[PDB]
Design a protein around this ligand. Structure first.
Ligand code: NAG
Ligand code: NAG
Ligand code: NAG
Ligand code: NAG
Lengths: 213, 213
């Protein structure tokens, strides 16, 4: 009937996921309109600079800061037509264990009590941290060894005083924290804490070298 | 005499410094040539994409990965002229104390021995870490309090067993590590470690809360 229109919808939407570090991430819409409408992309309320397409907003490289609400505004003034569509960007982050970045003791005093701590952040937040152990022996089958055993009360290489996992607020972020407390440092061993979400995994190796003073 | 030439030199050079996070960093040269020469920018041997000026290469945003050797190659084939000039980019990094990112004990057992550790990386690497202390009292004069005292053997709030600083290889980086060992956790106090280079400073606060069990 020759009448102007603006139709816009998600390809699937309203939520789109990308992993931190992904380049050229498209935020697309299904847009059919006549005549070609005026438009403007926004993020969390504020306009966006540069030449864009009304069919897809392209993010050069996503970080955790790229997370937010992206809005396409379309209008045909002469026709009195207006359409707003919003896309929720979720940027997932592969988990990191922070103690890895910090110095760690090379020697542990025999018979002593020792606490081993792993702090992990990621998006989504990993809700558990798994502890594993292996003997103080070389590896035959090699980041991998084949003799790693889960840490339990049954057949522990060193007696376990405790093993707790919780959520803690650290540097403006909610973080998962696990602490394995060894009641007595009897024998050298290797421990590791492993953490995972849907977009990645991380491991911290602890060389639990034990000597007498 | 109408003869073609290519002359290129550093504005000051050969070394240019920028801080990690700086945007639109110019790597400029003093270039006088006739006729307009052909040219190509490289980084550490590999060519660079995009439209550039032979007068200055513009880096959109610098990171520690932006560090390297940037080379302008100029040539006038018909004249048989060739000129290569290299600029050394150094990207400084404000220091970070990694233990800040990780969980930290809220309570310390009275009379016990406790080690406090700060691990710092930065560009340039900070060569020292300063330890300070203040009483377990509220602050009148407030990230700042006015009663912080340097940590020494004279008038220590808790007896100091040791205080060592060294360099350690951690996660593929050389890092400065300082460990303050408190011989006896007699009294609650606040400690902090402070670290600095020419482009920044960082602090980690430790709430040394002491109780009897
Ligand atoms: C579309 O978004 C803009 C910017 O937030 C807002 O001012 C306007 O009211 C919206 N228009 C419609 C059609 O909802
Ligand atoms: C962390 O967890 C608390 C408790 O559930 C929650 O209320 C808060 O929104 C979270 N904080 C952040 C910054 O994610
Ligand atoms: C300039 O740099 C290029 C690329 O590294 C190299 O192949 C060429 O030999 C250099 N030319 C001159 C004039 O040194
Ligand atoms: C760290 O320090 C060592 C000892 O001086 C030095 O040889 C090495 O180049 C440094 N390593 C790195 C990766 O900076």
């Amino acid at each position: 009937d020759h009448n102007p229109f603006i139709s816009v919808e998600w390809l699937k939407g309203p939520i789109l996921e990308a992993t931190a570090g992904d380049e050229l991430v498209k935020l697309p819409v299904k847009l059919a309109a006549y005549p070609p409408p005026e438009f403007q992309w926004y993020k969390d309320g504020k306009a966006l600079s540069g030449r864009h397409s009304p069919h897809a907003l392209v993010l050069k490289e996503v970080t955790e800061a790229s997370t937010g609400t992206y809005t396409l505004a379309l209008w045909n003034s002469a026709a009195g037509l207006r359409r707003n569509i919003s896309l929720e960007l979720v940027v997932n982050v592969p988990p990191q264990i922070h103690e890895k970045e910090a110095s760690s003791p090379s020697i542990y005093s025999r018979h002593s009590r020792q606490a081993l701590t792993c702090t992990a952040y990621g998006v989504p937040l990993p809700l558990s941290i798994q502890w594993h152990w292996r003997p103080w022996t070389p590896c035959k089958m090699f980041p991998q060894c084949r003799d790693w055993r889960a840490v339990t009360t049954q057949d522990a290489v060193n007696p376990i005083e405790s093993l707790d996992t919780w959520t803690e607020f650290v540097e403006g972020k909610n973080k998962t924290v696990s602490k394995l407390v060894i009641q007595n440092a009897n024998v050298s061993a290797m421990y590791k804490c492993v953490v995972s979400n849907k977009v990645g995994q991380d491991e911290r190796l602890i060389y639990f070298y034990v000597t007498t003073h």
